[PDB]
Every structure is written in C-alpha cells, then in structure tokens.
Design a protein around this motif. Sequence first.
Motif, short mmCIF file in Angstrom:
data_model
loop_
_atom_site.label_atom_id
_atom_site.label_comp_id
_atom_site.label_asym_id
_atom_site.label_seq_id
_atom_site.Cartn_x
_atom_site.Cartn_y
_atom_site.Cartn_z
N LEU A 1 1.02 -1.36 -0.25
CA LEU A 1 0.13 0.01 -0.26
C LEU A 1 0.57 1.38 -0.07
O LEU A 1 0.53 2.49 -0.48
N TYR A 2 1.94 1.61 0.78
CA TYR A 2 2.86 2.40 0.77
C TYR A 2 3.45 2.06 -0.72
O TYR A 2 3.90 3.45 -1.08
N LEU A 3 3.95 1.20 -1.30
CA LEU A 3 4.67 1.70 -2.58
C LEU A 3 3.63 2.13 -3.27
O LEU A 3 3.99 3.32 -4.76
N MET B 1 1.86 0.15 8.77
CA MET B 1 1.33 -0.73 9.52
C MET B 1 -0.16 -0.52 10.27
O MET B 1 -0.71 -1.71 11.13
N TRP B 2 -0.47 0.76 11.13
CA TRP B 2 -1.47 0.94 12.19
C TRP B 2 -2.80 0.87 11.24
O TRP B 2 -3.56 0.45 12.06
N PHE B 3 -2.64 0.69 9.81
CA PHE B 3 -3.85 1.26 9.02
C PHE B 3 -4.55 -0.09 9.04
O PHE B 3 -5.62 -0.34 9.11
N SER B 4 -3.61 -1.36 8.40
CA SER B 4 -4.01 -2.61 8.33
C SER B 4 -4.19 -3.23 9.62
O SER B 4 -5.34 -3.89 9.91
N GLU C 1 -4.17 7.77 12.26
CA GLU C 1 -4.63 9.25 11.45
C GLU C 1 -4.97 9.06 10.17
O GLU C 1 -5.16 10.04 9.82
N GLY C 2 -3.85 8.22 10.26
CA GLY C 2 -3.63 7.80 8.90
C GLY C 2 -4.40 7.38 7.64
O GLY C 2 -5.15 6.31 7.88
N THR D 1 4.03 6.36 6.14
CA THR D 1 4.86 5.74 5.50
C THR D 1 4.91 4.49 5.34
O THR D 1 3.97 3.40 5.68
N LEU D 2 6.40 3.62 5.99
CA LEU D 2 5.75 2.61 6.71
C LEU D 2 5.28 2.03 7.85
O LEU D 2 4.30 0.68 8.05
#
Lengths: 81, 15
Positions: A21-23, A35-38, A49-50, A30-31
């Motif tokens: 997703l970051y790519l 990581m917290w989003f998924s 808050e991403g 960023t990374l």
Amino acid sequence: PFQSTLWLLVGLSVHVVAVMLYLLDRFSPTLSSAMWFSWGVLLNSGIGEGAPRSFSARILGMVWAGFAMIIVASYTANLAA
Amino acid sequence: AAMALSLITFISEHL
C-alpha cells in the motif's frame, strides 16, 4: 478452530500488504503509517490518523475490510458449533 | 484477486 498453521500466515499476510500500500500510493500523481492502518482493521481499533488519499489504496482497503469481517463471523460460528 | 487489482489501475492513472 484454527490450527497454528493458520496463525503462521495471519501474522505475515496482513504485514506483507502494508508495504505494498505504501508502494502504490507514494508513486502516483510511510511504512509506520501503513502498519497501523491495516492491523487496526483486524482488531477493530481506531488507531492512527493515516488515510488512503490515493484511490488505489481505498479500493484495496474496501475489499480488505471484508477479509477481516469473515474471519470474525466464521470463528464465532465454530466456537458455538 | 485483489492483489493485481491496483496493478491494472496503476497504469491507467498515469494517462
């Protein structure tokens, strides 16, 4: 209901998509943020808050939520069975 | 099925 083989893949399947997703969103007109989003979706915790500003991550995020929902609903049935 | 969903649409956003 789920053997340790399943939990072997759970800890990596959620993590591997985080870098993807970051790519996708970064290199489009960023990374830690991803990581917290998924992971938060799987545990249903409103952490971070991403947000998926890019449309590509949103549609992938849409189907991703459905992957988590089936796991919770199905597992409840097994325990009640 | 969703793994390549973004890959197809990734090219379409450039144009």
